[PDB]
Amino acid sequence: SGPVPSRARVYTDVNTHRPSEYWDYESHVVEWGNQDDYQLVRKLGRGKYSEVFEAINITNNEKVVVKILKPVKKKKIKREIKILENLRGGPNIITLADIVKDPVSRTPALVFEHVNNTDFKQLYQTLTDYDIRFYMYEILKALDYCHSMGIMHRDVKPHNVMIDHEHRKLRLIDWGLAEFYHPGQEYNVRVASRYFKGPELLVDYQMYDYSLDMWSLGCMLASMIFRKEPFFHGHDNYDQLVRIAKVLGTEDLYDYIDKYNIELDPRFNDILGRHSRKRWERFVHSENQHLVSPEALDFLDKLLRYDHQSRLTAREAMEHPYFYTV
Numbered sequence: 539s540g541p542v543p544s545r546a547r548v549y550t551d552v553n554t555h556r557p558s559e560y561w562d563y564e565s566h567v568v569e570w571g572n573q574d575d576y577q578l579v580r581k582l583g584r585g586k587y588s589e590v591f592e593a594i595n596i597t598n599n600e601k602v603v604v605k606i607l608k609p610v611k612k613k614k615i616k617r618e619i620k621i622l623e624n625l626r627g628g629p630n631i632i633t634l635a636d637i638v639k640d641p642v643s644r645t646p647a648l649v650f651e652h653v654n655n656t657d658f659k660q661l662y663q664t665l666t667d668y669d670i671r672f673y674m675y676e677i678l679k680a681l682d683y684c685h686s687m688g689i690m691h692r693d694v695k696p697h698n699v700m701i702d703h704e705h706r707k708l709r710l711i712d713w714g715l716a717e718f719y720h721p722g723q724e725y726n727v728r729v730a731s732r733y734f735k736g737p738e739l740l741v742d743y744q745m746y747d748y749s750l751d752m753w754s755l756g757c758m759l760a761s762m763i764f765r766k767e768p769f770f771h772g773h774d775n776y777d778q779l780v781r782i783a784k785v786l787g788t789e790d791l792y793d794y795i796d797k798y799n800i801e802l803d804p805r806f807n808d809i810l811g812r813h814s815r816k817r818w819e820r821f822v823h824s825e826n827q828h829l830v831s832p833e834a835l836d837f838l839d840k841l842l843r844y845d846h847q848s849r850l851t852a853r854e855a856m857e858h859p860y861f862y863t864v
């Protein structure tokens with residue numbers, strides 16, 4: 539038979555009921571601006587096919603962020619531009635302000651609202667249980683919103699979450715891997731960053747949905763409340779599944795792959811082994827006990843499930859008792 543088909547439990551047909559103009563990014567008409575309105579200040583980082591810079595919009599003396607894209611694949615740039623335009627104004631979503639080209643080098647660049655990020659390697663051991671609840675809820679607002687718009691982010695991780703702690707401002711960034719969800723579509727599993735990859739990706743189950751972002755969110759929450767970064771520390775994509783199996787156990791892994799009739803890659807034969815299901819309390823230690831609670835453990839247990847259909851949706855997650863104090 540092949541693998542059993544699957545579809546999202548929420549926002550299943552949002553793109554189906556919309557015109558082609560919304561989701562057909564290949565037909566989208568991009569109108570470039572003039573990069574002369576912007577003066578580059580400093581480098582903020584470097585990605586696989588992008589260099590991010592802090593800049594000045596000289597026409598109003600306002601700070602902006604400029605992402606210069608290595609134009610490796612045109613279809614992918616068009617996809618990101620369309621999704622960004624589509625999501626513009628959503629809660630906690632980076633705002634694409636302009637799209638410009640270097641008049642001379644002709645390289646594409648995306649211009650965004652400036653976010654004053656506070657350091658990730660400093661924003662730790664000062665953060666409280668309340669702060670973790672607060673920021674997790676702000677990320678869920680972003681996720682429920684983009685999922686409601688028929689988009690899955692597919693690269694949820696701490697590097698893609700910008701926080702201005704002084705102003706308690708959060709922005710979900712880097713929509714370069716984002717995609718339109720269409721029920722029954724088979725997607726490329728070479729998405730997300732290793733530590734944040736959902737079991738569906740590691741077993742090569744192509745018919746995934748929004749729930750993939752919910753696995754990634756669980757990995758970020760686990761690393762935050764247990765002070766273990768990353769939580770699942772795989773050295774490769776095959777080893778990544780083994781690290782998950784050391785926590786969730788091999789019994790539920792076999793239940794998952796049987797339910798979807800997934801063929802497990804021969805490379806897992808000699809590395810998977812047998813593992814018991816671990817209790818979440820096993821990860822509580824003196825360094826992290828002030829951040830852990832029965833509510834946090836119950837919430838995590840509902841996100842970190844092999845079965846992508848059994849994971850909380852972003853809206854069910856926002857209703858969880860872990861967020862009653864927010």
Ligand SMILES: CS(=O)(=O)NCCCNCc1ccc(-c2ccccc2)c(Cl)c1
Nearest residue numbers: 582583655658673674696697699758762
């Ligand atoms: C250089 S750049 O483009 O600004 N990127 C760099 C991003 C820096 N990340 C900052 C970050 C992201 C997430 C969380 C987090 C908060 C609550 C729950 C889970 C995670 C924290 Cl503490 C810090």
